[PDB]
Ligand binder design. Structure first.
Ligand SMILES: CCCn1c(CNc2cccc(C(=O)NCc3c(F)cccc3F)c2)nnc1-c1ccncn1
Lengths: 613, 338, 61
């Protein structure tokens, strides 16, 4: 029902080949996945005493990387060096280079302790983890468990039944946002659920399309300052985005209640917005709709940049069209047929931050409809700075609101770093803004159906590996591992006393094995061999089969709304097969087709075996 | 052309060899046998059915005890059966699925088999630690194992699609003697009763006789028009029978150095896959791809009876040393004893 | 095929120089053999059903 249930360990046979065909059974690829790391970690710590010290050393460096001050780093660098460097050397147990030993020591004697001090040792740990150790990992239960977990991932088909909806959050142009819990893990998300009817009516199909594409270009790297996506899927009638949840309302809403903010409070919001914009700009996306309405607050008052529907990808093809809200657009943006890049947001930011301090856009003097005069003041008015402002604030705004891109902050040179280096932000530690350690100034209170058009929305569904694996790691991962270990332990003790099948796959030339089902459904365990496909019920050996010779072809087909393989057999006969998952399906197809085409190539060479007239 | 200057020379010997034989051909076996009484309707029935294999059966061979037999199947298993009761003595899962042949050692201590693995694997049927384990893999051939027969526990002979045959020291695991000459895949071999000689039959449509010890081809017999699939020694050691894709069996005499007799009929249209004689040599049993086994009067060339019990190719057969019974293996996955 | 005709010649050199026998003699002996062993061929000469494992035999060792 709702609980996550892992497949049995036998799924390894199918799964290992799936991954191996895709290049995904390598140390780099597994080690850098969250769940791959956690399972590789356990294996080294508990089941091989030659890789124990390596991973210990590794995790101790990774803790060291995150130490806030230079003094914490003098103390910890010395502990690491003592335990993982000097002692191992004295124990003759130190598998690392002379240059590694000297790089750290040479630095440590001079009391220079940068966060990346131990980088050469990181690369050499991986070097020592990457060969035999990694191979031994593949040969063990912990990779069997990786496969079980990977199986669940690549078989994700999200619907509404999978979530639990609480209450509404907002409305928009084609749809609305909602509060939801996700049943299996309990992780709380925001569900944006746009309607296809209204989309085709407003003809904003290019819009919904843009957002989903821009979201996936953004939703890697666990950025704290943009509302990112974890899933996307479709239903008969609507398009879901499962997004990071924000309950605290927007800065437009709060500006109106609180009134204008101090120079000190704007600063904090600015800091966070700048790191959001740094994130998108490093992935070649200009936001273009930076305004207070588009910045959201969580229960603690930390902020995120929200609606991505007007954002642009400027890597390949640079935008020139005027797009955005009128009192925040840049001179380049308004100018017809003029290319711009990320420079737009830096101007908007200057506009947006002035509004926090003064209650209106610099270039608007209470004009409602009249976009023109706003734009004309943008293209002539050097904005008047009240004497109230500090000179640090003054030059920041004067830098960001330069009319030429040639001069502006964050434009010619090094991007967000030019901004971060302003005297206005000189009190800040940018590491601490990122880690969200500065206290928020406001804590929010605690009380025409078309079959043709559907195919525009194929390639909409999506799951972000990195997002899903973190959801699992932080919620159910440990408890399900403990449970499905206990399940299996009793399966072993059951089979051992019920005459265990000394596995029928071993010591022959079996290509692959696993569960599938077949009507004449019936669940049976299959063994594919170079010249036949055996299968069996439980508590016996295989007592029936099909030969690679009598298989004419293998196709995918559809039965009772499910995808299943269809084998056309020699005697004009048919054979139908269900799999539990899309990977299994894909891999049987490939291996069956491989095997029979090669078997039938062989038999023809052998006069005793082939058919005669 | 040095190669011309020895090609016509290959003819002036191939003619000289036809000559010496034609000179010996003063009568025919059918003329000599024309007097003796017919054998009379040999109406054998099926007395046992062996169920167990899951796919085609490709080969079988009787133990010298006229009671146990091994069969070998597309299902990647040897099965050793007890024909008297129908029980299975061992069910041996193989390392390679693609076995084509199997053999039983005179002692009953070993069985051999092979196929597209290009390996003749020997199985100890009585491991000191009471188990059935592979005790040797004979590697050397560069084509598929098509047939094999033990001389004894330490010696075996093997035929192959690489066109060679070979005697093996099982202990050394080496070819003690190689037998080259054939120009096509070799399908079958029969060992003479005295195991001093053996014949082989190949897709070049010729059969050869070899000196086990000296490692040479003594005589080459031709006449078939297509692949020779099966070959069998006559009990007295002086003749042998073959079965071909050409729809005929033929009998060859060693000392006459030529064919004596052809067994065919205008209704019988597909190839023979297997042959052997009854104990006295009077009957020649042959298996067909038409699903039957025909029983021929070896001496008169008459069809004496049929065995119609299989729903696909009859792929192999054997006659028990005691002459008590015939075993037919089939692509239908069953063996029957008759 | 240089030294392929060489060994094909001398193989036939051997195959040619065996002393052969007349067919009538070969067929005579074949016929003789069968006749001398007809009594002992159970497919030609039935044994009692109780001696046949595949019909009526009861006791086996
Ligand atoms: C409190 C809701 C604020 N919010 C919006 C606001 N935008 C929005 C909300 C619902 C539907 C649509 C929509 O139909 N957008 C289509 C669209 C574009 F995709 C691009 C430009 C205009 C436009 F109408 C747009 N989008 N996501 C959120 C949101 C709310 C809470 N947590 C996380 N995210």
């Amino acid at each position: 029902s709702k609980k996550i249930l892992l497949p049995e360990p036998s799924i390894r046979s199918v799964m290992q080949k799936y991954l191996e065909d895709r290049g995904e059974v390598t140390f780099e690829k597994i080690f850098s996945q969250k769940l791959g790391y956690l399972l590789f970690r356990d294996f080294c710590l508990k089941h091989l005493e030659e890789a124990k010290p390596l991973v210990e050393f590794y995790e101790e460096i990774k803790k060291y990387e995150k130490l806030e001050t230079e003094e914490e780093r003098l103390v910890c660098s010395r502990e690491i060096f003592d335990t993982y460097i000097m002692k191992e050397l004295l124990a003759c147990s130190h598998p690392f280079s002379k240059s590694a030993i000297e790089h750290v020591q040479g630095h440590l004697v001079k009391k220079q302790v940068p966060p990346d001090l131990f980088q050469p040792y990181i690369e050499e740990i991986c070097q020592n983890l990457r060969g035999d150790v990694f191979q031994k990992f593949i040969e063990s239960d912990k990779f069997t468990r990786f496969c079980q977990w990977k199986n669940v991932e690549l078989n994700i088909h999200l619907t509404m039944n999978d979530f639990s909806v609480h209450r509404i959050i907002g409305r928009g142009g084609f749809g609305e946002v909602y509060g939801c819990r996700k049943a299996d893990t309990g992780k709380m998300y925001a569900m944006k659920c746009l309607d296809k009817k209204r989309i085709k009516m407003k003809q904003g199909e290019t819009l919904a399309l843009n957002e989903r594409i821009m979201l996936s270009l953004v939703s890697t790297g666990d950025c704290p300052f943009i509302v990112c996506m974890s899933y996307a899927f479709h239903t008969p009638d609507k398009l879901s985005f499962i997004l990071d949840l924000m309950n605290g309302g927007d800065l437009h809403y709060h500006l109106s209640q609180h009134g204008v903010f101090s120079e000190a409070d704007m600063r904090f919001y600015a800091a966070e917005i700048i790191l959001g914009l740094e994130h998108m700009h490093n992935r070649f996306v200009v936001y273009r709709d930076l305004k207070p309405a588009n910045i959201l607050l969580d229960e603690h008052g930390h902020v995120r940049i929200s609606d991505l529907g007007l954002a642009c990808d400027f890597s390949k093809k640079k935008p020139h069209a005027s797009v955005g809200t009128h009192g925040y657009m840049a001179p380049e943006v308004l100018q017809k047929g003029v290319a711009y890049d990320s420079s737009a947001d830096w101007f908007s930011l200057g506009c947006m931050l002035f509004k926090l301090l003064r209650g209106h856009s610099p270039f608007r003097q209470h004009k409602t409809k009249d976009k023109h005069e706003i734009d004309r003041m943008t293209l002539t008015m050097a904005v008047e700075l009240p004497d109230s402002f500090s000179p640090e604030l003054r030059s920041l705004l004067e830098g960001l609101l330069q009319r030429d891109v040639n001069r502006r902050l964050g434009c010619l040179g090094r991007g967000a770093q030019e901004v971060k280096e302003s005297p206005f932000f000189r009190s800040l530690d940018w590491q601490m803004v990122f880690l969200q350690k500065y206290p928020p100034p406001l804590i929010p209170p605690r009380g025409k159906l078309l079959d043709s058009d559907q195919e525009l929305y194929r390639n909409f569904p999506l799951t972000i590996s990195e997002r899903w694996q973190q959801e699992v790691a932080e919620t159910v991962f440990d408890t399900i591992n403990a449970e499905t270990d206990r399940l299996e332990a009793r399966k072993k003790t059951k089979n051992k006393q019920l005459g265990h099948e000394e596995d029928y796959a071993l010591g022959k030339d079996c290509i692959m094995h696993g569960y599938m089902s077949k009507m004449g459904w019936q669940r049976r365990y299959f063994y594919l061999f170079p010249n036949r496909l055996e299968w069996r019920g439980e508590g016996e050996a295989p007592q029936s089969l099909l030969t690679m010779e009598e298989i004419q072809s293998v196709e995918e087909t559809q039965i009772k709304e499910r995808k299943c393989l269809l084998l056309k057999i020699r005697g004009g006969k048919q054979f139908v097969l269900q799999c539990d998952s899309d990977p299994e399906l894909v891999q049987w197809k490939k291996e069956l087709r491989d095997a029979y085409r090669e078997a039938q190539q062989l038999v023809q060479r052998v006069p005793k075996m082939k058919n005669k007239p | 052309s040095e190669l011309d200057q020895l090609r016509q020379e290959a003819e002036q010997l191939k003619n000289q060899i036809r000559d010496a034989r034609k000179a010996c051909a003063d009568a025919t076996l059918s003329q000599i046998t024309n007097n003796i009484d017919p054998v009379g309707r040999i109406q054998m029935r099926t007395r046992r059915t062996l169920r167990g294999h899951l796919a085609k059966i490709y080969a079988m061979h009787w133990g010298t005890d006229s009671r146990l037999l091994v069969s070998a199947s597309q299902d990647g298993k040897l099965i050793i059966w007890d024909s008297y009761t129908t029980n299975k003595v061992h069910a041996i899962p193989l390392r390679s699925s693609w076995v084509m042949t199997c053999a039983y050692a005179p002692s009953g201590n070993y069985v051999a088999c092979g196929g597209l693995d290009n390996i003749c694997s020997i199985y100890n049927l009585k491991t000191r630690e009471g188990n059935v384990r592979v005790s040797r893999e004979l590697a050397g051939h560069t084509g598929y194992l098509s047939c094999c027969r033990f001389l004894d526990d330490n010696q075996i002979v093997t035929s192959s699609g690489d066109t060679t045959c070979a005697l093996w020291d099982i202990e050394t695991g080496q070819q003690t003697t190689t037998f080259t000459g054939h120009t096509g895949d070799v399908m079958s071999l029969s060992l003479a009763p005295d195991t001093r000689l053996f014949v082989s039959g190949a897709c070049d449509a010729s059969a050869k006789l070899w000196d086990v010890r000296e490692g040479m081809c003594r005589q080459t017999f031709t006449g078939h028009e297509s692949d020779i699939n099966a070959i069998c020694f006559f009990p007295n050691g002086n003749a042998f029978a073959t079965g071909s894709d050409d729809a005929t069996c033929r009998l060859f005499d060693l000392r006459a150095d030529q064919e004596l007799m052809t067994y065919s009929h205008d209704n019988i249209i597909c190839g023979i896959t297997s042959v052997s004689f009854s104990k006295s040599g009077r009957l020649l049993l042959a298996g067909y791809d038409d699903f039957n086994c025909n029983v021929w009067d070896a001496l008169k060339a008459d069809r004496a009876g049929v065995l119609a019990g299989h729903d696909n190719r009859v792929s192999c057969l054997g006659v028990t040393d005691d002459g008590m019974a015939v075993a037919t293996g089939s692509w239908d996955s069953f063996l029957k004893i008759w | 095929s240089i030294a392929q005709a060489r060994k094909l010649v001398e193989q036939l050199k051997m195959e040619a120089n065996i002393d052969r026998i007349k067919v009538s003699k070969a067929a005579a002996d074949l016929m003789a053999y069968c006749e001398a062993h007809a009594k002992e061929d159970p497919l030609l000469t039935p044994v009692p059903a109780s001696e046949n494992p595949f019909r009526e035999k009861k006791f086996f060792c």
